[PDB]
Amino acid sequence: SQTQGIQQLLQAEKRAAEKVADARKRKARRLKQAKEEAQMEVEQYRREREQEFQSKQ
Amino acid sequence: RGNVFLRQAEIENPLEDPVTGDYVHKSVFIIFFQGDQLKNRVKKICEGF
């Protein structure tokens, strides 16, 4: 009866912990997107710049 | 705003009391809050009285 309401409190605390889980997952994803975007940008730089090196040569 | 669960029991066949020596029957009425400052104030009044 009373410990059952405490189990409801535990349900809420588990939901909060799972929200932390979702958030830390999001953070890992965001950082990997950082690596992907930087790789795309620097790929563009290398490509266009080496093209201009070709043209200048 | 007493709004937390009650854990209550009755203890009979007592023993001599720590601070008076009274061989007096007891009964616990337990209500706990997870507030920290609330826990501190409750501890203050409970220990004092």
The gist of it:
The structure is cut from a larger assembly and holds chains A (57 residues) and B (49 residues). Chain A has one helix and no strands.
Which sheet architecture does the biggest sheet of chain B show? 2 strands, antiparallel
- Helical proportion of chain B? 25-40%
Determine the N-to-C terminus distance of chain A: 83 Å
How many strands, what sense, and barrel or not for the largest sheet of chain A?
none
Based on CA inertia axes, which overall geometry of chain B fits? flat
- Look at the helices and sheets of chain B and give the structural class: alpha+beta
The greatest interface between two protein chains, and residues involved on each side, is: A-B, 4 and 3 residues
Q: Per DSSP, what share of the residues of chain A sits in E-state strands of 2 or more residues? A: under 5%
List how many beta strands of chain B DSSP finds.
Answer: 2
Instruction: Please write the string of helix (H) and strand (E) elements of chain A.
Output: H
Number of helices of chain B: 1
Count of helical stretches of chain A: 1
What string gives the helices and strands of chain B in order? EEH
Described by its quaternary structure, the protein is part of a larger assembly
- The whole-angstrom Rg of chain B is 14 Å
PDB class: membrane protein
Keywords: V-ATPase, synaptic vesicle, membrane protein
Entry title: Intact V-ATPase State 2 in synaptophysin knock-out isolated synaptic vesicles
Chain A: V-type proton ATPase subunit G 2
Describe the structure.
- The structure is cut from a larger assembly and holds chains A (57 residues) and B (49 residues).
- Chain A has 1 helix and no strands.
- Chain A is an all-alpha fold and 57 residues long.
- Chain B is α+β, with helices and mostly antiparallel strands.
- Chain B has 1 helix and 2 strands.
- Chain B has a two-stranded antiparallel ribbon.
- Chain B is flat, with a radius of gyration of 14 Å.
- The relative contact order of chain B is 0.22.
- Chain B: Belongs to the V-ATPase 116 kDa subunit family.
- Chain B: This is V-type proton ATPase 116 kDa subunit a 1.
